[PDB]
Structures are given as structure tokens and as C-alpha cells.
Subunit: 247 residues, 4 copies
């Protein structure tokens, strides 16, 4: 197993991409801290799937944008399993608005979760990360295709791309790798809830996807396993677009 | 003259890159709104430079991260000159800190000015922008070279890069252009005050700059004039690295 | 004038983008060597346009893929005007073919002109260049959007992009700047002759162009003048996409 | 296993990166066509290492820059194993020269092998490729870092990057994936023979490598296995820099 004996944290693993990543890491032997914000039921369902398949996982509720919660998410890994090897910064929210319609709350909610939450959780985790550890930030293909009416959200993911590059260099001497995955449109709880599935944006994106379908959470999960594993030992500071060819 | 009859706003034009951009735009015929935050005297010096050279300019105090001040900056253009053609989002602050040392205040001050202030000032300006308008965002070469210990600052400029691309697509149908300049290290009031001139970072940047010197504010100002002018009429969504070849 | 007393070579200036660049450089005071391959009549017409407008120019026939012709083009600058300041590597050809249909002739004709010709002309020219010289390579937005059935042509322009970056670093110590322009679809003699204007690809590109039209040669010419001038003194190794926002 | 039942061609598998890729693909169950140009003994040793580990392989001599040899390499897969699933275009040569030292042979040798050979081998292969096939082009991090005195070699790899993007779009409807790996400096027989090991470039590269060593063939081979496998099913048109963090 590619991650035998390792411990991973996946933020926002009660739904969507994060849930798929948690299950996939556990399938390769990692014990997984499954973080949720509002959906304990979703996280418990993911933990039960992992444990019924023979793996180890534990649920932890916490808002990554709150310093004490980010710390407690990380402490859960150390207290439960004694070590930390892999951090997947997946928690994230998205809302579109044209420039005229942007409000302060629309801006702060997305930047606080999608950027400050990445920084706070990584800051808490790095004390426990040693040579060969792997930090995986879930960014978005919007940093390449920058759709209209996404200035705030695409802004958050542009920040994540740059933070990924900074920390790859900053943590290089400690041999901690830092990489991003930039998904295309993925069918998730969130893209249904946001009305993105079924929208004109979805139709446009689908038509421009070379491989001819929308993405699924497991399309991202298998790339996260790769980046978490030693097979990516010589990759750091990369941004892997996983969109079926759209960029 | 390239900008005869046009009106420009330069945020943060009491010092540094913004002051040089303001003077260069006025040299090509633009009437310039010269924004300051803490230094009225600096803005008055730039306005005096412009008017002594035969141009038109007016100072306005305002914090771009405050919605009411962003509105007052834009209203100054309309009240004084009756139109708005060019917006240069130059106001910005920088402070480095390694991941372990990042504080909430360090994060919020830079994102509020460097990202929210771009969004607020652009939001106020767009009501007045018509076909041929040009929005120029001052980003940074850090989105290319992502230096260690710059996670927050590089994050803000990654966000600006993405916002530039979004708004180029979003405002395209109105024939409003949106582009970024990504300066390398420029000798400015701010890089002196921040201790960056004389720092290890300065040494590293100089040692990797193909054209063999640090940048000066006029190195950026002449590119801003280009992007503001009809010479750049077929460029939108670009990010021009102006760093003497460092990328 | 921006290029007063300067001397420029434009390869492939009997038609299209190169003709527009030659006229624009001359409008800013440059004496221009107007190169043609098959159309002396076209180069002579561009020379007449330049001299009727008060400028200086001379035509020279030569195939940039032949070392002796590249040398003769450069010798024409030195022998006629005594110096060389600006080299625009604009000569290029394009033909689409899906992978199954690519022939050796289709491959060699495009790489010999579009790549070897850039190398040979730059190699002859660099001996005469000094501080402040500007080399401008005309690449293509296809290095961003890589359309189907363009493997050979996009291949040539990907080479040109890389050669631009190499020579920017290699000639940095001599303070010779090297930059690329990457045009979008431009209506020219060539794109009419190739049937590209009116194609389904043109409809797709137009629909994806934020500024809502196809490009024209003067859209590129004004950017070439900027890069040739001291206004771009702090830019080297850049690739300026000039496509109305398509990338 | 990840490639059970599948068949791969690795061009240039008698040495270096290609040898390591061939052995790694076979470890995951692929039958491997091991192509060599000058070194039958090297290919035979790779084939033997593969069969000793329980796999299937066959050696074939051929110059990818010769159409008849490229066709025979592909025919070897079909005649020996009946199918083709993975093509690794790894064959490549490198020689540095500053612009004034570039000769016609130096240019043609590298473009014929590194670009035309990729096109010819891919052209022969595509007839046999169906849904789920994976084409992996070995490019180079020089397309990011474009070192001085590498205009021809970096030019070839810039062409490979662009060809990768074209064919990803062109072959997307057939659900054939096309991706590139862009290695940093890898210790191989070729870098020994080229005077790269022990050069000033090796010192420059190693000092700018965040993860603190030179690369090894298996650093690339594990990424090739990922791209060949269904784990990369949602990635096409990507360029994976595998350089220990240098870009
Ligand atoms: N098409 C796409 O789906 C797409 C494309 C590109 C990038 N992305 C990125 O992929 C990531 C996941 O997207 P998704 O579509 O899977 O989202 P989703 O279905 O809406 O799931 C979001 C997950 O993040 C959690 N979360 C949200 N805010 C949080 C906070 N403050 N603290 C902790 N956890 C928080 C949610 O927790 P609860 O549900 O328990 O509250 C949930 O587990 C995000 O970073 C998103 O930006 C998605
Ligand atoms: N090497 C560099 O200098 C460098 C490199 C890359 C990018 N940049 C970017 O270039 C821009 C200018 O940098 P600089 O070095 O010229 O800076 P500077 O010398 O420190 O000048 C900063 C200017 O921004 C104004 N400003 C700051 N906060 C503001 C706020 N909240 N509202 C309105 N105006 C505000 C300042 O006003 P007062 O002084 O009146 O308070 C001043 O006019 C920034 O966006 C920076 O990130 C700089
Ligand atoms: N949409 C576009 O038009 C477009 C988009 C992106 C990039 N580009 C690039 O822009 C450049 C100009 O394109 P264009 O559309 O203006 O082409 P064009 O109208 O066909 O004109 C091509 C010019 O190049 C010259 N030329 C061709 N082969 C030559 C050779 N071997 N030696 C010397 N000169 C040679 C031609 O000379 P003669 O006519 O006298 O033989 C002519 O002056 C090319 O590099 C092209 O790849 C064009
Ligand atoms: N640092 C690096 O090593 C580095 C970095 C980035 C990219 N790359 C790329 O990685 C690839 C492999 O490099 P390497 O260092 O492993 O090279 P290497 O050790 O020199 O091995 C080259 C291989 O290519 C074969 N080859 C050469 N010309 C050929 C032709 N015309 N037809 C068929 N096969 C041919 C050789 O065959 P014979 O030996 O049997 O003649 C050999 O098997 C190349 O594409 C190179 O550009 C290498
Ligand atoms: O536009 C796309 O291709 C994906 C949009 C998706 C949901 O907003 C995201 O990037 O998070
Ligand atoms: O890294 C450089 O060369 C530039 C640093 C400069 C001041 O922090 C900035 O990007 O604002
Ligand atoms: O596809 C586009 O956007 C431009 C195509 C054009 C002619 O082939 C060129 O790149 O030279
Ligand atoms: O410059 C590097 O980091 C790698 C050089 C290597 C051999 O020339 C190549 O790209 O093929
Ligand atoms: Ca884009
Ligand atoms: Ca970089
Ligand atoms: Ca693309
Ligand atoms: Ca570079
Ligand atoms: Na304080
Ligand atoms: Na660019
Ligand atoms: Na990449």
C-alpha cells in the first residue's frame, strides 16, 4: 500500500472531492482525519466507509478559518494516530457574483475559508511534518480559465496557487513537498447546491472539455493519492490541472 | 499625445510606482486623480509636479479598503473632470513572514488593501467606464517566483492576477480592457521603509536579474502608459512581467 | 520620435503583420529594412508607403531559412544605414494538418522558416547589437490555445517561445532585450490565402474573444513599436499575447 | 496491477530515463517495446531486467527520425503483442551552443530527433490507439527556465510542449490522453556523455533545487507510470515539471 503507516488530514471531507480523497487515501493505507464544518453526518458516513473497508479514520468538526479549530484538527491527528504525513487543504466554498454585485460578506466568506483557512491549517500542521511529508492544496482550474462573475472565487484560488509555490520553496530545505490540484468542474454536493450543475456555465465547460464529460470526485482523488505518495517524490510547487483537458 | 482628453485614477500615487505612473499618464495628456492614504503632502507634491509640467491633476485622500473611500476616489474623477477612462489599481502593502510567524493582522492588512481594495475601487469605477477604458492592476513578479516567506503577500498578488483575468472576460463585451503589470523589485519609498532595500532578498533578486540592476518607478510607469493607451487596444487579460527579465 | 535615428529589420514585411510593423516603426523614426521572399512588389509598396510618409526604408529579397540570405538581410541594414537597433523576426508560414496527414514537407517547410529562420537571422544580427537593442519574435497565441490539427505550426511557435526566453537570458549581459508577441487571429494576406478567415476555427476563436472581433495587422504593429522602444526597457523574456483576450 | 494486459512503447529505452520508464511500466504489468538506436546491448539488458522480474518485453532498433523506422517500432508492438495502449516519446538528444555557435547540423540533429521523431512515432501509433490510451512526451524543464546557450535544445522542447497540447485537444474525442513530463536535471548516460555532469550548469541547477539533490531516472519513471495509468484518467494536455521544485 502506497501510504501504509501514514496519517493524513483532509479538510472538508464530509462531502464531494474531500470525501473521495479521504476514502482513496485510506484505501492506500493512510489513517485519515475526516474534517467537517456543518455535516457531522457526512463525515461519519465517510469514516464508516473507511473503517468497514478495513481502514482507520476519525471525524473532527472544525471551521478552518478559525485558528483554534485549525489547531484542533491538527491535534486530532497527533492525539489519535501519533504522527502526521499528509495534509490535504480541500475545504472551500464558491459563489459567483459580477463585479457590481460583490458584497463585503461575499468577499470575506470566501477568502477567509479558501485562503486564511489554508494558511491556518498548514501553519498548525507544519510543526509535525518531516522529510517526505506532502501538502496538497485543492485550488481550481478557474485560475487558468477565470470565468466571468467569479472575481472573488477565482481570486481565492489564485492566492492558493501562489501560496503553493511559496511554501514549496520555503519548506524545500525540510523536504516537505507542497503541490496543488486544480480541478475542472466536478459533480459534487456543492456544485448541485450552488446551482452550477444545470447552469449555462456547466454547458459551456462541458462543451469545451476534451475528454467529453464532467468530472467526478474520484477523478481528483486518484491524483491526490499520487501527490501524497512517494511516486511524486520529485514534484513540488506544481499545479496539476485535472479537468479532462480544459485549461 | 497618447491620452489626450482622457481621465485616469491612480490609487496610491503619493509615493513610489503610483507617483511615477500618475506623472507619466499626465505627460501623455491624461488628467489624473492622485490618491493618497496617509500622505497628503506626497500627493500634493505629485499634483504640483503634474501641473508645473502643464498637466491637470487633483489629489484625493482615501483608504481603498473602505467602500466609502473607494467611492469618493471615483467620484473625484467624475466631479472634477466629468469622465473616467483609466483606473490604475496601484495601492498595495507588503510584509514577509514565514508560515510559522504569520499573524492574523499580517494576513488581513495585506488582503484588505491589496485585494479587497482592488475590488472596491474597480466596482465603484465600472459604472463610469465605457468602450476603450483600461483598468491596470499592479500585481507583482512574486506570482512567478513565489519567494520563501511571502505566503501572504504572494497570495494577494496571485489573487490580483486571477481577478485581472476574470474581469478581462467579464468586461470584454463592454470593450473595457483589464491587464496587470507584475513588477520586479523597484526602488521605492516603500521598499526603503520595509527594509527590503539592503536585504538578502534584494541581493538574491539582483543576482538573478538578466538586465543587471534593480528597477526604478519609471520602468513601470512607461508600461502603464502603454497599457492605458490605444497602443494596447488588442491586449486584455495579460500580466506583463516588468522585472528586467526575472521570472 | 521613439525610434529616432534607429535602424530596424522586419523579416517578411511584404504582407500582413510584418508590413504593418515596418510602417509603424518608420512612423516612429526608424529606418526600416523591408524583407520579402516571393513578393518584391509587396516590399516595394511598403517602402513607398514609408517614404511617401517621410520615412526611410529599403527592400531586400531573402529566404530567412537560408544562412546566406539571413546574412544578406542584415548586411543590407549595415551597408545602407550604418547600424542596427531592432530586429523583428516576423517571417513565418502556417499550414494545418491532423496528425495522420502530416508529411515531411509540411513539417520541414514550417520549422525551417519559423524556427531555423529566427535562429539564422538573429545569429547574423546579434553581432551588430548593443545595449538597448530590441529583438522581437512574432510567435502565436497557438502556444496557449494549441488548436487541433496544428501540431507542426504550434510546434514551431512553441520553439519560438522557448528561444525567446533563452536569448533573453543569454543576451541579458549585453542588455539586448528579447521578447515575443503572440498574436491571436489576424486578418492578413496569409490568413485569407490559407482559408483561415471564414473557417470554423475562426468562428470558434471569435466566439471566445472577449473584445469581440478578429484582429488586424495594426493591432500587432503598435505592440511591436512599444517593445522596440525604450518604454519597454525593463521587459525581456516576455511573451505578449495580443489576441483581444483569447488565451 | 495498474497496467495489466496493456502494451507500451518506450522510445530510447536502452539508456537513462527511457530505460527506467520501460522497467517501471513493466513492473505494473505492461508489455514493453524497448526501442534503441545505437545500443542493442542496452536494450537487451533492459528487456532482461523486465523478464527477470516476471514481465514481457522486446527490443527493437530504430531511428525515430526516420519514417520507416518509426513505423517499424509501432509495428513491433502490434506484431508481438497485438495491441498498443501507451506510447512514451522519450528518445531525445541535447547539445548546448550559444547563438553564434549554432550550426546547421547542431540544429537539424536535435529537431529531427526531438520533434520530428515525436511526430513520426505518434503518427504511426495513433492508428492503433483507442479510448484510454496514454501518450507521454518527455519534454524538459528548460521550457520553464530556458537556460542561456540552449536555444536549439530548448526550442525542441518548447515544440514538444506545444505538440502535447495540440494532440490532447485533437485526440480528446477519441479519449486518448496526451501529457508531457518536464524533467529537471537527471543523472543519466547522456548527461555524462554531454558534459553536463560536473559542469557549471550542474552546480547552478543543484543550488536552485528546493529538494536538495539531482534527479534520478526513477524520479521520472514513477510519474510516467502515473500518467500511463487510469489514475491520470482526468488529466490531458498537462506538462508535469519533475525537477525537485525548480521552475
Ligand atoms: N467543480 C468543483 O466541485 C470544484 C472545482 C474546482 C475546485 N473545487 C474546490 O474543491 C474543494 C471542494 O469542493 P467540493 O465541490 O467538493 O465542495 P462541497 O461539495 O461543497 O464540499 C465542501 C466541503 O468543505 C467543507 N467546508 C466548507 N467550509 C468549511 C470551513 N470553513 N471549514 C471546514 N470545512 C469547510 C464542507 O463541510 P460541511 O459540508 O461539513 O459544512 C464540505 O466537507 C474546494 O476547495 C473547491 O473550491 C471544486
Ligand atoms: N519592488 C516594489 O516596489 C514592488 C514590486 C512588485 C509590486 N509592487 C506593488 O506596487 C504597488 C506600489 O508599491 P510601491 O513600492 O510603490 O509602494 P510605496 O512606495 O510603499 O507606495 C505605496 C502607495 O500606496 C498607498 N496606499 C497604501 N495603502 C493604501 C490604502 N489602504 N489606500 C490607499 N492608498 C494606499 C500609499 O499611500 P500613502 O503613502 O499616502 O499612505 C502610497 O501612495 C503595490 O501594489 C506593490 O504591491 C511593488
Ligand atoms: N492570424 C495570423 O495572421 C497570425 C497569428 C499568429 C501568429 N502569426 C505569425 O505572424 C507572422 C506573419 O503572419 P502573417 O499572417 O502576416 O503572414 P502573411 O500575410 O502570409 O505574410 C507572411 C510574410 O512572411 C514572408 N515570408 C514567408 N516565408 C519567408 C521566408 N522563408 N523568408 C522570408 N520571408 C518569408 C512573406 O514573404 P513573401 O510574401 O514576399 O513571400 C510575407 O512577407 C508569422 O510568423 C505568423 O506565424 C500570424
Ligand atoms: N537531465 C536529463 O537527463 C534530462 C532532463 C530533461 C529532459 N530530458 C529528456 O529526457 C529524454 C531522455 O534523456 P536521457 O538523459 O535519458 O538520455 P540518454 O541517457 O542519452 O538516452 C537517450 C536514449 O534515446 C535514444 N535515442 C537517441 N536518439 C534516438 C533516435 N534518433 N531514435 C531512437 N532512439 C534514440 C538512445 O538510444 P541509443 O543509446 O541506443 O542510441 C537512448 O536510449 C530526452 O528526450 C531528453 O531530452 C533529459
Ligand atoms: O468553472 C469551472 O470549470 C469549475 C467551477 C467550480 C465551481 O465554481 C470551481 O472552480 O470550484
Ligand atoms: O521579489 C521581488 O523581486 C519584489 C519584491 C517586492 C517587495 O516585497 C514586491 O513584490 O512587492
Ligand atoms: O488560431 C488562432 O488563434 C490563430 C491562427 C493563426 C493562423 O494559423 C496563427 O496562429 O498564425
Ligand atoms: O537544465 C536542466 O535542469 C536540465 C538539462 C538537461 C540536459 O541538457 C535537459 O533539459 O535535457
Ligand atoms: Ca486563461
Ligand atoms: Ca515559478
Ligand atoms: Ca491551453
Ligand atoms: Ca522562466
Ligand atoms: Na500591534
Ligand atoms: Na504574457
Ligand atoms: Na504543470
Amino acid at each position: 500500500s502506497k501510504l501504509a503507516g501514514k496519517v493524513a488530514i483532509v479538510t472538508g471531507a464530509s462531502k464531494g472531492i474531500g470525501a473521495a480523497i479521504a476514502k482513496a487515501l485510506a484505501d492506500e493505507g493512510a489513517a485519515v482525519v475526516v474534517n467537517y464544518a456543518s455535516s457531522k453526518a457526512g463525515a461519519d458516513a465517510v469514516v464508516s466507509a473507511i473503517t468497514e473497508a478495513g481502514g482507520r479514520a476519525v471525524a473532527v468538526g472544525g471551521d478552518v478559518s478559525k485558528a483554534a479549530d485549525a489547531q484542533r484538527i491538527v491535534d486530532t491527528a497527533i492525539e489519535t494516530y501519533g504522527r502526521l504525513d499528509v495534509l490535504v487543504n480541500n475545504s472551500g466554498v464558491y459563489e459567483f457574483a459580477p463585479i457590481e454585485a460583490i458584497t463585503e460578506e461575499h468577499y470575506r466568506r470566501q477568502f477567509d475559508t479558501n485562503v486564511f483557512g489554508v494558511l491556518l491549517t498548514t501553519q498548525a500542521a507544519v510543526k509535525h511534518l518531516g522529510e517526505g511529508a506532502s501538502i496538497i492544496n485543492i485550488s481550481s482550474v478557474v485560475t487558468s480559465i477565470t470565468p466571468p462573475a467569479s472575481a472573488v472565487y477565482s481570486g481565492t484560488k489564485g492566492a492558493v496557487d501562489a501560496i503553493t509555490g511559496v511554501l514549496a520553496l520555503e519548506l524545500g530545505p525540510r523536504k516537505i513537498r507542497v503541490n496543488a490540484i486544480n480541478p475542472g468542474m466536478i459533480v459534487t454536493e456543492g456544485t448541485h447546491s450552488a446551482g452550477i450543475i444545470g447552469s449555462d456555465l456547466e454547458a459551456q465547460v462541458l462543451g469545451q472539455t476534451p475528454l467529453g464529460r464532467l468530472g467526478e470526485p474520484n477523478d481528483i482523488a486518484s491524483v491526490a493519492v499520487f501527490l501524497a505518495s512517494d511516486d511524486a517524490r520529485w514534484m513540488t510547487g506544481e499545479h496539476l490541472v485535472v479537468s479532462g483537458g480544459l485549461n
